């Protein structure tokens, strides 16, 4: 509720103090990772989502995969962001939100390739068809 | 329960052939020491066969499984 | 006999949260009252 009320400063400290007692509540990991994204410490968030996926999900959980994609986007792992959302679309292609995010990552990668003329032909051809 | 666990431990330490002291300890250990409960149920299983020479009750085996 | 129930499943292994979170609520309660 403090997080919904916008009090992330205290909410993070609370989620951390709850996490100290147990490593098996994903929401505590997820709440901490969300605040880490909001606090722009994207590496830590990505690390939490990657290990959360490996520990708690016997399959790639699209919710965690999407949270990871949101962090990866900001984390500069555009390659992994692309790959993570392509994996997500491979897992849930009828979920139009994930499909949008795939299209968005293709757009953001192409934006970089298209801005700098140093980008090569295979990159530009991929960027054109991907875009 | 903690006082009971401490005393029942003393009972098993003084009388390791006391199958009941081990299982009662196991019953408390189930909450806090699953391996301890396994150790107690296993010990009761072992004592019955070797020293009391009576067959092992299935409850002990079920608890070992659980 | 089963030790983990719908009530105990919600309880920590050994850490008590009351003292710290109530200290946090000491800060939050003032904000909720607009002080």
């Amino acid at each position: 509720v403090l997080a919904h009320k916008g009090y992330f400063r205290e909410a993070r400290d609370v989620f951390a103090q709850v996490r100290e007692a147990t490593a098996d509540i994903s929401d505590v990991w997820l709440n901490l990772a969300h605040i880490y994204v909001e606090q722009k410490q994207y590496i830590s968030a990505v690390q939490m989502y990657e290990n959360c996926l490996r520990k708690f999900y016997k399959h790639q959980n699209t919710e965690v995969v999407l949270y990871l994609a949101r962090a990866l986007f900001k984390c500069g792992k555009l390659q992994e962001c692309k790959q993570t959302l392509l994996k997500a679309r491979h897992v849930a292609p009828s979920d139009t939100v994930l499909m949008f995010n795939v299209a968005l990552v293709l757009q953001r990668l192409a934006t970089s390739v298209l801005k700098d003329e140093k980008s090569n032909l295979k990159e530009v051809l991929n960027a054109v068809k991907e875009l | 329960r903690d006082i009971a666990k401490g005393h029942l431990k003393k009972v098993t330490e003084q009388y390791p052939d006391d199958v009941e002291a081990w299982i009662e300890l196991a019953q408390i250990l189930e909450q806090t020491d699953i391996q301890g409960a396994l150790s107690a149920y296993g010990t009761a299983t072992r004592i019955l066969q070797e020293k009391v020479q009576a067959d092992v009750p299935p409850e002990i085996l079920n608890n070992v499984g659980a | 006999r089963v030790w983990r129930t719908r009530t105990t499943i919600l309880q920590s292994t050994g850490k008590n949260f009351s003292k710290n979170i109530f200290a946090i609520l000491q800060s939050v309660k003032a904000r909720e009252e607009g002080r």
């Binding site: 929401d27 | 409960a37 659980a66 | 030790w3 499943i9």
Partner: peptide, 27 residues
């Protein structure tokens, strides 16, 4: 100017109920 578009993900601060504990019963 249009505020910068983030990855489309509905923000959920969760407090999910734990799975009901139906652990094996001791005798």
């Amino acid at each position: 100017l249009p505020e910068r578009s983030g990855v489309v993900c509905r923000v959920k601060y969760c407090n999910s109920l734990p799975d009901i504990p139906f652990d094996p019963k001791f005798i």
